[PDB]
Amino acid sequence: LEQSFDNSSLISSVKELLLNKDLIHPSILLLTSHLAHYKIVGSIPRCIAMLEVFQIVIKDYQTPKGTTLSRNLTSYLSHQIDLLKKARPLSVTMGNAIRWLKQEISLIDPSTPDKAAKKDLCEKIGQFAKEKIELADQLIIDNASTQIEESTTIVTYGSSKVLTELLLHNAISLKKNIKVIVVDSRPLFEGRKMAETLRNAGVNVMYALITSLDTIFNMDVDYVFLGAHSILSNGFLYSRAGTAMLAMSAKRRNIPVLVCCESLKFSQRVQLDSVTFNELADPNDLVNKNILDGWQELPSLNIVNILYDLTPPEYIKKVITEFGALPPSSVPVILREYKGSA
Amino acid sequence: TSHCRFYENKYPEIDDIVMVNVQQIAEMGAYVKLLEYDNIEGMILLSELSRRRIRSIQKLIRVGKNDVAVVLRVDKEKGYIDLSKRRVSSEDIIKCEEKYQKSKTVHSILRYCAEKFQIPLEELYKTIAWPLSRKFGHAYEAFKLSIIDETVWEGIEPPSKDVLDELKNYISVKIRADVEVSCFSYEGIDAIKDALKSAEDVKVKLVAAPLYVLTTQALDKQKGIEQLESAIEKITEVITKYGGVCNIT
Amino acid sequence: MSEFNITETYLRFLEEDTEMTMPIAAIEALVTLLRIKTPETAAEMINTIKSSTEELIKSIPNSVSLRAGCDIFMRFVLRNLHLYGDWENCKQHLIENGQLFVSRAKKSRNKIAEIGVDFIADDDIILVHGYSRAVFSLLNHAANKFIRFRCVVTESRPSKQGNQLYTLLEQKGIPVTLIVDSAVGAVIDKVDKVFVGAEGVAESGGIINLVGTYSVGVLAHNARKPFYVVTESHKFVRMFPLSSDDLPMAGPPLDFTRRTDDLEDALRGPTIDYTAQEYITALITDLGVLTPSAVSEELIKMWYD
């Protein structure tokens, strides 16, 4: 109660909406129970999953009697959004996809016989997942592969989103020597998902933990890469928690820090303090007769966890996006010149 | 050997309409190779591709894919030649696309002939290409009329007659039915004969006394929908007037 | 009939004047390439100039100012290739634009001074590093303004450039000393302002000139003295490193080989360092005073697509 941060209402832990007011798609109930119960995702996996379940929910139209397709679908899809809003708070890859999707719903005209609706929403959202995600990531690979010399190391963090393919490309498709160090954190052990895939493909993975973060950097080490959840308007990064400690340790021990991001993921909002806009994530996960049971019913005890916190832009040497490399203080120029306009 | 000219001029002479694909775009525009003279290549300017400035994220989706392009200028002794597709009308797209589909379906019928009879590809190609593409339009509707009017083959000679036979060999569907004649009669044979005498005149085969395998030929695959059904109807008609029982799968 | 590659056009007029520098010499050679060799077709023109830029980089690789000039020439022919004159006028329109750099970039250096004289205020002891002639083009007009200052010139080991300034503005009549390059930390507590000159600007604002401008920059930061850099607008280059180590000279900056008998041992470490955007605080170009995030935007807009 001294800082009162545990009563931050940016997430609501209410569950079990039983209301049959709308036709909630059973696939989207599978998607929400797949997100919120056992988190299998990053950010662009959530974006591709949300996008290819909205694919199915527009393919299964079921239009009402007197309402045109241009006058129902945004409210229907917003009530589809509300279940994910209950499940897990949204990324910017959530938001900059759904507002684009609503803008593309808006420019349809009341003459579609609900047969070309597929041909201008399914194909167009496939062009979205092609353009603003996948070939953009292909440009990320082809832009960041020239900035890695042979026989070096890489320190990623958590589950990567795009640069798993970068490490696989520079490991196998370009055959230059590389020694990836993957480090992750309690409780979402999502660096192991990178470690299984990278070592299954046959690259020198050396897993670690973030508590032992000192002895990684005392080896021969350079080129810390970082997956991003969003990049703010100032230059502050925003990603899975525990990123910023190895960011400040990496800048402290004068070895460079990079962020592989794409122009879909830049955000309009602004913050500079870490615990301001943030997600509380289910404090029963930090236990696994257990070690302790019942932080409740014991007065004066609490268990907190944080998913998201900010590296200051002094630490990131280079944000790379599909247009090119850039200093992190110069992200509003791609907020204004390229995001949305491309 | 592999592929060669259209019409015995080294380059696409000024202001004709050809087809290309874009290879890569860095700062000059694309290094478009000409799809009609395949091994050759030209280029094209950035401001010439549309009017819009091409995004890199837009630049990546277009490479490799092919399109139509008019030719502005040509060096007669250098292969360093320009293309253009801002000044291409909408009708010319479909016209040159039809001409190039025509071109590919008259190239594919000679590629394997030259590379499996093992002769120089260009010589017999040009001895076809002088009279048939100079007299009128080239080899597609020339060869669709050549198999019915054989004066094309004797108008000019090929160096061998095996490629002649293979070109005659190149350019020149069953719906299965297991109808079960489960009859218990005395005038059934006659009925069966009658059925045969209308459903076969498509491919009808006896298996035993009850089972018959008939594979009805379809032209649009959907034109045998009106055939099989008709046959079934005939069968139904047939057995009520004789005494037996026919059942259809 | 010249071929414009190495020395049949380029290295000739470098002996005409020891005032013109490398990148505008590259601009002059690349415009006089297509000022004559213009074979009436837009295809082989760009192939010729791209081949010429790559062989000219292939001539001398370790003089990255050359890469800056040879790449802003490509930006010039791209934007002058824009406005879409159907190549009918552009064979004349581009070449009559042409020499606007040698009428423009040659007289940029006093345009530097006309906006940079109002930095060196009264009684400012000044630290410069290396023979960066745009700094002297500022200082010449500063001393012609009759303003009172003092200058301190570092060594430029091993590239000798620090000995030139003391035989340059002494005879102009400025009280100047020549400090040795290792003595910066004992004097930069007293130096009011420090100027350098770049041989390149990265995509975030960086100084890619000489041996130890990162050392004098980090001395300027931990003395909290303002670290300005005088340059001009033909020094933008795409090369954006991330370490303090650029493209190599011929091998790594840390050699550990064996001297055979008596070969040279001074130039064995690096010779061109890099400065991050934090240590510089204002740079001077033709485009006005320019904070490093502004030079990042200016080099981020004309190089994307």
Curated annotation (Swiss-Prot), chain A:
GO terms for molecular function: enzyme regulator activity; translation initiation factor activity. It comes from the Eukaryota. GO terms for cellular component: cytosol; eukaryotic translation initiation factor 2B complex; guanyl-nucleotide exchange factor complex. GO terms for biological process: cytoplasmic translational initiation; regulation of translational initiation. Its main location: cytoplasm. Keywords: Acetylation, Cytoplasm, Initiation factor, Phosphoprotein, Protein biosynthesis, Repressor, Translation regulation. The keyword RNA-binding does not apply. It is found in: Cytoplasm, Cytosol. Component of the translation initiation factor 2B (eIF2B) complex which is a heterodecamer of two sets of five different subunits: alpha, beta, gamma, delta and epsilon. Subunits alpha, beta and delta comprise a regulatory subcomplex and subunits epsilon and gamma comprise a catalytic subcomplex. Within the complex, the hexameric regulatory complex resides at the center, with the two heterodimeric catalytic subcomplexes bound on opposite sides. Belongs to the eIF-2B alpha/beta/delta subunits family. Present with 10300 molecules/cell in log phase SD medium. This is Translation initiation factor eIF2B subunit delta. It comes from Saccharomyces cerevisiae (strain ATCC 204508 / S288c). The lineage of its organism: Eukaryota, Fungi, Dikarya, Ascomycota, Saccharomycotina.
Curated annotation (Swiss-Prot), chain B:
GO terms for biological process: formation of translation preinitiation complex; translational initiation. Residues 15-86 form the S1 motif domain. It holds the Pfam family EIF_2_alpha. The modification Phosphoserine is found at S50. Gene3D superfamilies: EIF_2_alpha (3.30.70.1130), Nucleic acid-binding proteins (2.40.50.140), Translation initiation factor 2, subunit 1, domain 2 (1.10.150.190). It is found in: Cytoplasm, Cytosol. The keyword Phosphoprotein applies. Belongs to the eIF-2-alpha family. Present with 17100 molecules/cell in log phase SD medium. eIF-2 functions in the early steps of protein synthesis by forming a ternary complex with GTP and initiator tRNA. This complex binds to a 40S ribosomal subunit, followed by mRNA binding to form a 43S pre-initiation complex. Junction of the 60S ribosomal subunit to form the 80S initiation complex is preceded by hydrolysis of the GTP bound to eIF-2 and release of an eIF-2-GDP binary complex. In order for eIF-2 to recycle and catalyze another round of initiation, the GDP bound to eIF-2 must exchange with GTP by way of a reaction catalyzed by eIF2B. Eukaryotic translation initiation factor 2 eIF2 is a heterotrimeric complex composed of an alpha, a beta and a gamma subunit. The factors eIF-1, eIF-2, eIF-3, TIF5/eIF-5 and methionyl-tRNAi form a multifactor complex (MFC) that may bind to the 40S ribosome. Interacts with CDC123; the interaction is direct. Interacts with GCD1. This is Eukaryotic translation initiation factor 2 subunit alpha. The lineage of its organism: Eukaryota, Fungi, Dikarya, Ascomycota, Saccharomycotina. The gene is SUI2.
From Swiss-Prot, chain C:
Disruption phenotype: Inhibits GCN4 derepression in glucose, amino acid, or purine-starved cells. It is found in: Cytoplasm, Cytosol. The modification N-acetylserine is found at S2. The keyword Lipid metabolism does not apply. The keyword Protein biosynthesis applies. GO terms for biological process: cytoplasmic translational initiation; positive regulation of cellular response to amino acid starvation; positive regulation of cellular response to heat; positive regulation of translational initiation; regulation of translational initiation; translational initiation. The modification Phosphothreonine is found at T291. InterPro entries: eIF2B_alpha/beta/delta, elF-2B_alpha_N, IF-2B-related, IF_2B-like_C, NagB/RpiA_transferase-like. SUPFAM superfamilies: NagB/RpiA/CoA transferase-like. Belongs to the eIF-2B alpha/beta/delta subunits family. Present with 8970 molecules/cell in log phase SD medium. Component of the translation initiation factor 2B (eIF2B) complex which is a heterodecamer of two sets of five different subunits: alpha, beta, gamma, delta and epsilon. Subunits alpha, beta and delta comprise a regulatory subcomplex and subunits epsilon and gamma comprise a catalytic subcomplex. Within the complex, the hexameric regulatory complex resides at the center, with the two heterodimeric catalytic subcomplexes bound on opposite sides. This is Translation initiation factor eIF2B subunit alpha.
